[PDB]
Amino acid sequence: EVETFAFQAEIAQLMSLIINTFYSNKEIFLRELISNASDALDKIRYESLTDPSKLDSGKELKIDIIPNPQERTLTLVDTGIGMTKADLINNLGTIAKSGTKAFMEALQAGADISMIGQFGVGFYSAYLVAEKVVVITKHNDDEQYAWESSAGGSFTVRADHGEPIGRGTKVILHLKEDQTEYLEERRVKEVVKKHSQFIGYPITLYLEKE
Numbered sequence: 001e002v003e004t005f006a007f008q009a010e011i012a013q014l015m016s017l018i019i020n021t022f023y024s025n026k027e028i029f030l031r032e033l034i035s036n037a038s039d040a041l042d043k044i045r046y047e048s049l050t051d052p053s054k055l056d057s058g059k060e061l062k063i064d065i066i067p068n069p070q071e072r073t074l075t076l077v078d079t080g081i082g083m084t085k086a087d088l089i090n091n092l093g094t095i096a097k098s099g100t101k102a103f104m105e106a107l108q109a110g111a112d113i114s115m116i117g118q119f120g121v122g123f124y125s126a127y128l129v130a131e132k133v134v135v136i137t138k139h140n141d142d143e144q145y146a147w148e149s150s151a152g153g154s155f156t157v158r159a160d161h162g163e164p165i166g167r168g169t170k171v172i173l174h175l176k177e178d179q180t181e182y183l184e185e186r187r188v189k190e191v192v193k194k195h196s197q198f199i200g201y202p203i204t205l206y207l208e209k210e
């Protein structure tokens with residue numbers, strides 16, 4: 001059963017700005033999504049020190065980046081803490097409102113879009129290159145969910161009965177037609193080396209088969 005929700009007006013405004021503003025330095029999306037994965041990995045690692053059972057859902061802490069030219073998708077998979085249903089519908093957005101406001105104000109005062117991560121809303125930089133984002137996520141003590149948005153003011157959340165991911169998050173970027181450069185491991189490697197070379201988890205960059 002698919003439930004459809006409206007973004008808060010401010011977040012919809014932010015998404016529209018990211019989609020409609022002329023800004024050529026789009027590659028920064030990858031640094032932001034990798035940093036989100038790293039943060040999530042940091043969180044489950046820290047929690048596991050006082051409750052080792054939190055790793056019963058998977059011991060390995062890693063990030064995989066998988067380009068699929070045929071599906072026109074770039075997928076970032078982490079085995080971090082994951083997100084709950086409450087995160088997806090309510091709590092991440094509640095937190096994001098103030099960061100969104102501060103970022104929008106910063107842009108008006110001369111900041112550029114590449115500073116988005118400092119405001120906690122770097123996730124939304126995905127829409128620099130993606131027409132649709134699907135997030136499959138699994139947190140301990142909650143079910144696996146699929147979140148989806150093609151912007152336009154709404155997102156959906158549904159229980160996901162696809163392949164279990166155990167714990168963590170799969171961010172599936174359905175790329176815009178003119179952003180297919182990010183479907184080549186060569187380009188992805190260049191971006192990772194430039195912006196994400198010191199991330200403290202193994203990042204495996206898959207090669208496209210075709």
Ligand SMILES: C/C=C/Cn1c(Cc2cc(OC)c(OC)c(OC)c2)nc2c(N)ncnc21
Nearest residue numbers: 036037040080082083092096121123135147169
């Ligand atoms: C500061 C927000 C952290 C939530 N988060 C995001 C970014 C993110 C995902 C989101 O939903 C999937 C968000 O709400 C739509 C959101 O709003 C700022 C941010 N990636 C991940 C991830 N890989 N693993 C665990 N949590 C994550």
